[PDB]
Structures are given as C-alpha cells and as structure tokens.
Amino acid sequence: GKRQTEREKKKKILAERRKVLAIDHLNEDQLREKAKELWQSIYNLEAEKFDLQEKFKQQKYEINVLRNRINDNQ
Amino acid sequence: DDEETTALVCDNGSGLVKAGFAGDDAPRAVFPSIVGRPRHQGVMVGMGQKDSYVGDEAQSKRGILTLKYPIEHGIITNWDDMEKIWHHTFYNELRVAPEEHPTLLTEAPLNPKANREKMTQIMFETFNVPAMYVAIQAVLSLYASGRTTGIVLDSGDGVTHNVPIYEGYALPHAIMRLDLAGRDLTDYLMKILTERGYSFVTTAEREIVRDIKEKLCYVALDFENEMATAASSSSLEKSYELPDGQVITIGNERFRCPETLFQPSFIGMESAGIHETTYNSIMKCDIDIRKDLYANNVLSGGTTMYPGIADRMQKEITALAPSTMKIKIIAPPERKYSVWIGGSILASLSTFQQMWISKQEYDEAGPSIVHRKCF
C-alpha cells in the first residue's frame, strides 16, 4: 500500500548508504581495506538476510496454519 | 502449477463476491459483499476493535454492525467501500498480490459508463494489475452451458437481465434489463411477514429474512390453486428457528414471496414478469432464429434456484408461444456459479489471450479505453 512512500524511503536509505569516496581521502591499500570491509559487511548482511528468509518461511507456516484454524472455526 | 501466469477471475456481483483462479471448477472464496461499521460505543480497551468488518467477518459480528451493501443495482454507489471489498478479496481470501495477475471483472448489461471506467481506473491505479478485461455477465453464463446459441435469463440478486445470443452473434437491440431481483424479493418477504406478527427492521435482520427466503420459499406451479389450498388445509405451514429460539411458522408467505418475479405488480413495479420479458425479448429477434432460442432457453444466476421455477416458467412460455415450437428450459444444477464457471472457461482460452487491456494501452488512451475495440 502507498508504494510511492515506500519507494521514497528505500531511495533515501540507499542514499544514506551511498558510500562514494573522494580522490585524496584514501590510499590504494586503504581502498582495498575499504573494499574488504564492504565485503565483510555484505557477508554479514547476507547471513542476516538468510536468517530473515528462514523466519519468513516460518511466518508462512504460521500464516497457513492460522488461516486453516480460522476456517476450521466455522 | 508453477511457472507461467494464471488469471484472476473475479466476479463482483451484488450480494456475493465470487472469485478464484482461472481453470478450476468452482470459485475459491465466496463471501457476502457487505461492509459494516460498528454503531455502538465500545467500552473494553485493547480488544483490538477494527473500524470496518468486510466480507464474511461481518456476517458473524452482525449483531452490533450496520451492514450496507456497496452495490445497489448492478451499479456501484459507494466507491470507497467497493475498493475495500476488492482489497480484501485480493489479499485475504486469495492471498495473491495483484501485481502479477490479470483480472477479468464482470458487469451487467446496459450499465452506466462511468461505473465501468471507474472500475478500470481503480484496477489499474490502486491495485496496479498487469491487464484487466470486463465481460457481460450473460455471455459467460452461456459459455458455462457449453452452448453457442440460446437466450439466457440471468436473474441475479441486483438486477435481472435477458440477453439473447445466436451463433455467437449477440443481438444488442433485444436485451431486456429489469431491476427486480433477489433483494426486492427479500424486502417484499420482510414486508409480508408482518402480517403474522414478526417484525424485522434492522439491517442485520434483513440477513435473517434472506435466510428464511432461501430455505423455505418456493415457486408455485399454479398460483390460484396454491392460494386456495393454503387457505383451507395446513399442509404447507413450515416452521423455522430464529437465531435465538422462538420458532416462526410461514404459511402462504412461502410461494407469495417469489411469485413477485412473475407478477411485478406486487411490489408496485409496472413491468411484466420474467415469464413475459423473455417472450418479448425473443419476439424482437429475427423470424428465423426464434425456434433455436425457444429450444435453448437458459437459466442462470442465484435467484433462479427456487424449487419449482423451471416448470412454472416453461408452462408460462408454452402458454405464450405458438403451439408448434418446442420450449425447453436449461437449468443446470450449478446455476449459482454458472457465470463464474463461464468466466474461468473464457479466461482459459488461447484465442482470448490477446484481448486483455494491456497497461501500456491504458496509459496511452486513458480509462476510456474500455469502450473502444477492447470491449
């Protein structure tokens, strides 16, 4: 519902994480370290998202069992 | 199932919303189309009381609600409530997001244009479907019978319309739409019950009167003989238990409620009954296709489920029609869902797959696209 506000919020959050770097604010070794830091953050995010997907699978389980119970009420 | 994409065959109707995926035998979710706000004050805190119960939930809490149908006679009179009903239908009764499914609504004949245009605008802007198509409620009922000719009398709950079709060519000048339907029969039954002492007034008790009508009323084969019999014997008086006890006994109100269909003068309507508007609809057709229409008269819609109507109607038409023609009335047992079964069949066809109103087409011509070639 109201996809415009959701899109605006997602774009704002992405712009918050718009980690664009300058030219003389880092080093080449520092740039590699930043790349590895982003890699590790993405891996932690992937683990969190996989846990979220498992939790959403359990949410689907709860959804179907609850709708089944509600239909069983009548 | 799996890949691919299935169509949503929704059917707004007026009284029962019937929906389900294309290609099945019966609608997946059938529930009354009523939206009822609570009317009392409410003292318990934190009970989780919502502001509007829609669908089948408001038929269980109807004791403290004010149910109000959003569709009066085919046309839609309250667009916010109709949007709420559609949202419920998509998300809670089918649990399929509309962003990935074509929709096939249904509409009565001779309805206002603005209703249809607003319907398509809602479906394309709010729910954001990929493509939707609007079809006349009688052609589908003709699909479901497996015929290709015949004159179909689709006596729903909102409006009764009678569309004749021959060899697939609809006759637009012979559609006879009459606004007597199940709702007026419910009101008339509620009005004649007062002759014994039972008074139903609240909009919630209209549902109880509807249940009485469904379970007890029947159409008499001959009206005067039944009126004479019910006034002498007592073999007709059937009793029924209200939702709280205090059983009631319905006498000759049983066959007087649905008799209004064949004599609309009972509720003050001028027009002729459903037995004579069919004959008039036939006589407007050409002289060479009248035999086929006589032989393939089709019944559909909910209100044509009264026990004994397929014989009364045949007797009446045989009285009106010439003596040589054979009069046959097709009354399939799956009458109530005939329109939706036909809708599923139509949506499952390969030849029909390019008739949908694609979204880019709507973006180029606006909501008035529905009246154009994509009908």
Binding site: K60, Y61, N64, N68, R69 | -
Partner: protein, 160 residues
C-alpha cells in the same frame, strides 16, 4: 536439560536459607536407627509449603534410578530445587514454535502423523499401549481424522 541448570541455580540467597533452616530444624538424627532412607517424604511433610505434585513425583521417581536409597549433598540441592518454584516454567514458547516449524519443514500446514511416526522410529522408544493412542487422541482431537495446529500447540504447552 533444564534440570542441571536448576540444580546449579539452587545456590542463591533464598533457597540456601531454606536449606539451612530445614537442616537446623528437622535434620538432626537422634532417631531409633531404622535407617530412614525415605526421609524425602519427611522433608516434604516438614516443608509446610507443598509444591506442584508433579515436582514431588518426579523427585521421588527420577532420582536414584539405581535404587541407592542414599542422597548426597548434590541431591540435597536437587531436593531443595524441587522445594521452590525453580522449574523452567514450561521452557520457552519459542522452543515450541521452532519444534512446530521443524515438524512442518515439509510445509504441510500441520504436524502430520508421519512426522511423529518417523520421530518415534528415530528415538526407538518401545511401542506401548499409549503409543499411537496419544497420537490418535491429539491428532484426532476433533475425532474427524484432521490434525489442526492448535491440537499439538496446546499439547506441547504446559510442559518443559
């Protein structure tokens, strides 16, 4: 399981005081020398506060499975755990939800009798009269052959 955690958590300020008071009051000796190995019941009688009967029954049954008839200081701590409400209180409802999800890893919308059958086959427990009887009673709570979520939901509720 939670029994060992309860035994460890026996060491506190309240239950230690209860144990010390019980020892100072009705743990002295100077009896007739009958060897009162069943003094656990005597401790229950002198407790003055009767816990839930399940705790007392489990204390009488589950301990000294070898029939030793002798209780150590660790067993004194276990008995004092049984005195107060040191139970896990039906474990965590999250555990029941995770168990139900693992049962419905096949996404059947409920715990099918096949799930309990294969779990019983894996555990190898002897098929007694209560075996299958309990499965049919819980699954057919409506006695219509349909197994609903609430059946095993409340069946697994109230226990640790």
């Amino acid at each position: 399981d939670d029994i060992y955690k309860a035994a460890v958590e026996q060491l506190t300020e309240e239950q230690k005081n209860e144990f010390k008071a019980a020892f100072d009051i009705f743990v002295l000796g100077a009896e007739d020398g009958c060897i009162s190995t069943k003094e656990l019941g005597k401790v229950m009688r002198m407790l003055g506060q009767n816990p839930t009967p399940e705790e007392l029954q489990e204390m009488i049954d589950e301990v000294d499975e070898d029939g030793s008839g002798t209780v150590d200081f660790d067993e004194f701590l276990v008995m004092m755990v049984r005195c107060m409400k040191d139970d896990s209180k039906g474990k965590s409802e999250e555990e029941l939800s995770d168990l139900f999800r693992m049962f419905d890893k096949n996404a059947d919308g409920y715990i099918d009798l096949e799930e309990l059958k294969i779990m019983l086959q894996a555990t190898g427990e002897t098929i007694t009269e209560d075996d299958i009887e309990e499965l049919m009673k819980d699954g057919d709570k409506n006695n219509d052959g349909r197994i609903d979520y609430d059946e095993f939901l409340e069946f697994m509720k109230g226990v640790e």
